[PDB]
Amino acid sequence: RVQYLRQIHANHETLLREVQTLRDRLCTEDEASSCATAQRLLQVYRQLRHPSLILL
Amino acid sequence: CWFGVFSGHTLGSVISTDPLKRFFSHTLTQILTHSPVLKASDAVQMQREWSFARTHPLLTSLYRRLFVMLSAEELVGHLQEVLETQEVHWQRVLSFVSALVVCFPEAQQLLEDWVARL
Amino acid sequence: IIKEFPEVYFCERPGSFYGTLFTWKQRTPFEGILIIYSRNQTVMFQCLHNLIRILPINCFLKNLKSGSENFLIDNMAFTLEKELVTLSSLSSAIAKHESNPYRKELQREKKKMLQTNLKVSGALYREITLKVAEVQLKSDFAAQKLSNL
Amino acid sequence: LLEVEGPVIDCDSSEAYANHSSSFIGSALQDQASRLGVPVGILSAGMVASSVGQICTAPPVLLTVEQRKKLSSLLEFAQYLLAHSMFSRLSFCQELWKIQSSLL
């Protein structure tokens, strides 16, 4: 079905642009490269790995 | 070209019809409400000029598309509430009902319902 | 200093450290990175003692196994900015495959056209889930190097 | 570049059409950025937005010959820069809105 894959697509394209702004901030050294970024990405990681890859 | 992209064959395919319905409903209200001139209750002879064949075919085509992506009784309820709520552009409403009656499957009786209520 | 590689200092203090070798790469002249090639593991303690005496007071040392935390954060982000691109490509390739009285008659035809796009190729989904699986593998590797640190 | 260095395009950093190698251009941006004390991202952004202005000006809504070819080779280099994390998106967007007229 399709509603399904769009729900996933939207939930992904928020995290994608979130990461992209985070990468720009690391480019311009705006925040830091220390931590809380590390702890943020390891939160986005956890979020994806729970129902990773239903294979049908 | 604007009405062409508006025609939801390329768009309805990709877009979930939760926000797309809100888009079309807001679009209908924003067509009806905007520039409520010729509010003259003496807009009686102008019904002949707002006859379906005289109303521009572009208006007609857009209304067809808005009828495609939505349901009839939803539209009738929405119209009842809007015409009760707020001012009208009579040109668009009268052209709109003229296209509505012929386009949807026998909703002249669903019209006469809320006519009797009003 | 060694001239040929000025990033290498060799200690010539004639007691216990002689033949130690260090390198100092500074970055944001707050932060910096010290690497001690020493001749046993005692001599690396006697050095980190002697030093943490002569730094300023809030100097926050830390051992690194697998590269400086900045580098790992890039290497983490890269493998998420690849994965989430691939999971977009999934839905986009899918959304190509879905596209591939007079008024009442045309009304019903166009309604039938819009009810056709409920379905998606399982085979294609599968092709994409192998492309994704490949990047998940790279991301999860790069997350274990980070969560140790 | 007028203040620190005495009296900008990819031609500037690469020095008068030497080569078109992606790694070579990366090392040129590193050298330039080392001189100016600016992060490499913002140099990349500025140079790319300038070269985009150039391409889109040199002759209307569409541009569909040879413009597209130069543009795709340039954007193929932008993707290299993005993958090596040598590109501020937001500095790029700002430097395009500074153009705001040349763009199609």
Curated annotation (Swiss-Prot), chain A:
Transmembrane regions: none
Assembly behavior: Belongs to the multisubunit FA complex composed of FANCA, FANCB, FANCC, FANCE, FANCF, FANCG, FANCL/PHF9, FANCM, FAAP24 and FAAP100. Forms a subcomplex with FANCB and FANCL.
Organism domain of life: Eukaryota
Signal peptide residue numbers: none
Organism of this sequence: Homo sapiens (Human)
Function, as annotated: Plays a role in Fanconi anemia-associated DNA damage response network. Regulates FANCD2 monoubiquitination and the stability of the FA core complex. Induces chromosomal instability as well as hypersensitivity to DNA cross-linking agents, when repressed.
Compartments, record wording: Nucleus
Protein name per the record: Fanconi anemia core complex-associated protein 100
From Swiss-Prot, chain C:
Protein's recorded name: Fanconi anemia group B protein
Organism whose genome encodes this protein: Homo sapiens
Compartments in which it is found: Nucleus
Disease: Fanconi anemia complementation group B: A disorder affecting all bone marrow elements and resulting in anemia, leukopenia and thrombopenia. It is associated with cardiac, renal and limb malformations, dermal pigmentary changes, and a predisposition to the development of malignancies. At the cellular level it is associated with hypersensitivity to DNA-damaging agents, chromosomal instability (increased chromosome breakage) and defective DNA repair. Some severe FANCB cases manifest features of VACTERL syndrome with hydrocephalus.
Lineage: Eukaryota, Metazoa, Chordata, Craniata, Vertebrata
Entry function: DNA repair protein required for FANCD2 ubiquitination.
The organism's place on the tree of life at top rank: Eukaryota
Complex and partners: Belongs to the multisubunit FA complex composed of FANCA, FANCB, FANCC, FANCE, FANCF, FANCG, FANCL/PHF9 and FANCM. The complex is not found in FA patients.
Swiss-Prot record, chain D:
PTM info: Phosphorylation is required for the formation of the nuclear complex. Not phosphorylated in cells derived from groups A, B, C, E, F, G, and H.
Compartment(s) where it occurs, according to its Swiss-Prot or TrEMBL record: Nucleus; Cytoplasm
Subunit description: Belongs to the multisubunit FA complex composed of FANCA, FANCB, FANCC, FANCE, FANCF, FANCG, FANCL/PHF9 and FANCM. The complex is not found in FA patients. In complex with FANCF, FANCG and FANCL, but not with FANCC, nor FANCE, interacts with HES1; this interaction may be essential for the stability and nuclear localization of FA core complex proteins. The complex with FANCC and FANCG may also include EIF2AK2 and HSP70. Interacts with FAAP20/C1orf86; interaction is direct.
Role this protein plays: DNA repair protein that may operate in a postreplication repair or a cell cycle checkpoint function. May be involved in interstrand DNA cross-link repair and in the maintenance of normal chromosome stability.
Disease connection: Fanconi anemia, complementation group A: A disorder affecting all bone marrow elements and resulting in anemia, leukopenia and thrombopenia. It is associated with cardiac, renal and limb malformations, dermal pigmentary changes, and a predisposition to the development of malignancies. At the cellular level it is associated with hypersensitivity to DNA-damaging agents, chromosomal instability (increased chromosome breakage) and defective DNA repair.
Descriptive protein name: Fanconi anemia group A protein
Species in which this protein is naturally found: Homo sapiens (Human)
